[PDB]
Paper text:
To further confirm that the different conformations between HCDR3 from H3-bound or H4-bound AF4H1K1 and HCDR3 from AF4H1L1 are due to the allosteric effect of the paired light chain, but not due to that induced by the HA binding, we solved the crystal structure of free AF4H1K1 scFv at 1.4 Å resolution as well. Of note, HCDR1, HCDR2, HCDR3, and HFR3 of the unbound AF4H1K1 scFv possess the same conformation with the ones from the H3-bound and H4-bound AF4H1K1 Fab molecules. In AF4H1K1 Fab, the HCDR3 loop bends backward to avoid the A-helix of HA2, allowing enough space for the bulky side chains of Phe107 and Trp109 in the hydrophobic pocket at the base of A-helix. In AF4H1K1 Fab, the amino acids Gln90, Gly93, and Ser94 in LCDR3 loop form a continuous hydrogen bond pattern with the main chain of Ser111, Gly112, and Gly113 in HCDR3, which drags the HCDR3 loop to fold back so that to hinder the neighboring Trp109 and Phe107 side chains from flipping upward, whereas in AF4H1L1 Fab the hydrogen bond network between the main chains of HCDR3 and LCDR3 is interrupted to accommodate the bulky side chain of Trp90 in LCDR3. Compared with the free AF4H1K1 scFv molecule, the HCDR3 of AF4H1L1 does flip away from the LCDR3. This demonstrates that the conformational change of AF4H1L1 is driven by the paired light chain but not the result of induced fit due to HA binding. Here, for the first time, our study reveals that light chain could contribute to the binding and neutralizing spectrum by modulating the conformation of paired heavy chain.
Fortunately, we obtained one neutralizing MAb against IAVs, named as AF4H1K1, which can effectively neutralize H3-clade viruses in vitro and possess the prophylactic and therapeutic efficacy against both H3 and H7 subtype IAVs in vivo. Further structural analysis demonstrates that the epitope recognized by AF4H1K1 is located in the HA stem region and the light chain K1 can modulate local conformation of paired heavy chain to change the protection profile, compared with the non-binding AF4H1K1 single chain variable fragment (scFv) and AF4H1L1 Fab molecules. AF4H1K1 binds most of group 2 HAs with high affinities, with KD values from 4 pM to 49 nM for H3, H4, H14, H7, and H10 HAs, respectively. The AF4H1K1 Fab fragment binds both H3 HA and H4 HA at the stem and vestigial-esterase domains with a similar orientation, where the Fab molecule is roughly orthogonal to the HA stalk.
Residue numbers in the entry:
A (entry chain H): 3 to 132
B (entry chain L): 1 to 108
């Protein structure tokens, strides 16, 4: 619509070792035109970058803490971003934010320069029970 | 791989005081690609500064970012009640990494 909105969904209480898919619905902009990210915040701790997908959809990168277990993807026809999380661990408890990056275009390696996060969603809480 | 560290852990100040927040990178930040964010309790982060010194749209003049190489600074010239929050730096010179945050709280 008029204002840019990012709305995350899918969070809840989940048991160790299970899988969960989060979603981020964008409005007011076309998410396929930007690098899109997931950033999480564990309770009482700081922001931790999780994953990026480039505007072309062909490149994805992940934090070492989640690589191999998480997958970032996008549904271009529905303006939606997804995070598929497998083998959930106690350290995955956090509120998960979807964020837009207006700078990043090419990411040929995991060490090249990236971008900053100009719009954020409200977050969705994932709690791994014990 | 680039570790970002912020100081101090907490600033306890009254409204009207100036706040100076420091952020140090373990390696020089390419192109001075350093951003600052504000996060109020229970809210999502808000972009304040990008490219170490450029204000985002709608950010008041009292906020300024500076620095280069490994050492960066966010200054709030006069704290307003809405400025009490947690502030994060984030480098994007090599991948994406955040500092641990500095809490700016009202002095009691």
């Amino acid at each position: 619509g008029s204002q840019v909105q990012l709305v995350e969904s899918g969070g809840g209480v989940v048991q160790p070792g299970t899988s969960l898919r989060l979603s981020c619905e964008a409005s007011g902009f076309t998410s396929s035109a930007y690098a899109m990210h997931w950033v999480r915040q564990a309770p009482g701790k700081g922001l931790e970058w999780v994953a990026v997908i480039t505007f072309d959809g062909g490149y994805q990168y992940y934090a070492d803490s989640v690589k191999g277990r998480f997958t970032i993807s996008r549904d271009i026809s529905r303006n939606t971003l997804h995070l598929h999380m497998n083998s959930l661990r106690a350290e995955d408890t956090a509120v998960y934010y979807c964020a837009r990056d207006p700078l990043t275009k090419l990411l040929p390696f995991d060490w090249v320069s990236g971008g900053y996060f100009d719009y954020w969603g409200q977050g969705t809480l994932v709690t791994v029970s014990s | 791989d680039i570790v970002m560290t912020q100081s101090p852990g907490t600033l306890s100040l009254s409204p009207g005081e100036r706040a100076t927040l420091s952020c140090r990178a373990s390696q020089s930040v390419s192109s001075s690609y350093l951003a600052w964010y504000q996060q109020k309790p229970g809210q999502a982060p808000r972009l304040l500064i990008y490219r170490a010194s450029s204000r985002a749209t709608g950010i008041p003049d009292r906020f300024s970012g500076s620095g280069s190489g490994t050492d960066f600074t966010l200054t709030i010239s006069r704290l307003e009640p809405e400025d009490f929050a947690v502030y994060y730096c984030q480098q994007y010179g090599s991948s994406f990494t955040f500092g641990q945050g500095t809490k700016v709280e009202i002095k009691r």
